[model samples]
Target: AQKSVKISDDISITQLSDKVYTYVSLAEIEGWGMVPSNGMIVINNHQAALLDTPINDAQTEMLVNWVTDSLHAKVTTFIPNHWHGDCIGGLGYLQRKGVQSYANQMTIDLAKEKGLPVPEHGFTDSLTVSLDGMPLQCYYLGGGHATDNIVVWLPTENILFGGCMLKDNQTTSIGNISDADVTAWPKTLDKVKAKFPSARYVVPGHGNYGGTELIEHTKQIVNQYIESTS
Candidate 1:
């Protein structure tokens, strides 16, 4: 927590490696109050690839400016895990800057239907975009928090940006499941665990990031959710 640099009352950034940082922005929910949404930044040479965004365009503008002013890095690429405003609300701002954007096909469809700013490119299952020379992978193993939910993998750091599909170490319940496929929630976790068995830094969409136990914690919440549904 102390490692994170407070950008504002609602925004924070924590560097995990020399070229990787976790960008967290808060949104107000009724019960959750201020809910922190997670995103990632990968710097390669002097360019950066961003995964997700702050809750709004105003915050994303601040983020983009911070990267340019402080880090002197250019944000070249952007991706959102799903179509939710928490993920794509800032995309229109990035689009104005000509930031290349990509998303799952389902996410694109949803964004189009919802009248949100649509992504420029779409991939079905997974995508690997080059960062300088290293690879930044995005995978949609199965549905969880959102049907279009996906995880971003940084091969160089072994960091899994689990997005909203994953619950952090502190969360006891799977917060929102209105658009989620409850039955597939744990199943998707199984796929994530198997695919990235060597993942060291697992950053969930909210709360504190940790090792694989975050997966275990989320699985327990899935159990809680399942029982409640019955």
Candidate 2:
């Protein structure tokens, strides 16, 4: 069992594996809260990597400690889903623990441009980080949530971290997609759809954890909004 806040009917978190956990949030849409992004903690061999730190330091620390204590693992790496602070607030905390941080080069640049701390390492294109035999694919989809947004694919567990590119299921309408590459988001999402078409559990940055349908719904909604607004 894991503690989580129900943003809507479409999102919640639970223990999906031995020490791996997900926090699914509700999307900011049609009366839902604003941009409900989530994060994850994957514990492997008493070591863990966190995906997307929360918006504030307190939340990040609490999340890190929760996962560390529950899994008996220490934070080894922190992956910022994007360059935004809400997505990487644990940098300082992880840095204090001597945990290295990894991010896409673009995210690194964004951090620098915004005066945020740079990641310990930055990789471009497709990169793999193994966690106790689990290979997490950092697939830079080119541009969807941002030009630097990347999807974390866990093939063995059939989990695809779609990040903010994929909408939260409870989100009936889209959010501030204008922040994304509006013209390129649709194509990028198509690429993601084809890339992980067989994903069993799609963990989006915001919304309920679901299957491929969430991807499709997100794509459709976003594209529709973009098209109509454009």
Candidate 3:
């Protein structure tokens, strides 16, 4: 029985596998109250890499510090799935704490234009960092949810941090797609599926995380949109 570590009324952390944890936080949507958002943590070889953050600074500060004391490792590197506020809202805090941040170059530029906190390092297509004996890879296949949305693939664990590009299990459609590359979404997903064919788990940007079926469900939703509009 894997128990969830409850951090607050709106934040929690749970272990999915060895050195891999899911960081979930809740925030309000206009119609939906306190919707859940998801990120991930990979602790390897005495170092930790945090992908995304809680919806705000207060919750993120709580999360970052909790991981430090409880997990016994400080997150030295941070990354976001995209430039969305929900994904990067706590980046300023991390930056102030001296954590190195990385993002797709487009996200860096977009954040600058949007007056959001930009990542300290920007990679063109992909970036990989090997910590001790573990590896974490970030790949920007193409944009679907956001122009700079990227997925973190921990190949050793076969977990794909699909981010906002992949839909949740319960989600019926791709929500909040205003900034999305509608035409590129399906193809982008195809690229992901081909690239990480062995992924056993998929973590979306919101709602629940599931297996490869989440990918099919998301593709179905996007295909539906394509069919309906045509």
When 1 and 2 are scored with TM-score, the better candidate is: 1
* Per-model CA lDDT versus the true structure: 0.85, 0.74, 0.85
Q: What is the lDDT of residue 220 in candidate 1?
A: 77
lDDT of 1 by residue, 138-199 (tens): 88888898899998899989999888888888779788888997788888988899999999
Give each model a TM-score.
0.95, 0.87, 0.95
Q: For model 3, how does the per-residue alpha-carbon lDDT over 44-85 read when each residue is reduced to its tens digit?
A: 866888999876788889888888888888888888999886
Residue 116, model 2: lDDT of 82
> What's the CA RMSD for each of the models?
1.6, 4.0, 1.5
Candidate 1 stretches with Cα past 4 Å from truth are 29-32
Candidate 3 wrongly placed segments (more than 4 Å): 29-33
Give a tens-digit lDDT track for model 2, residues 50-120.
88876656556666676655568888877888876557754776677777787898898888888887887
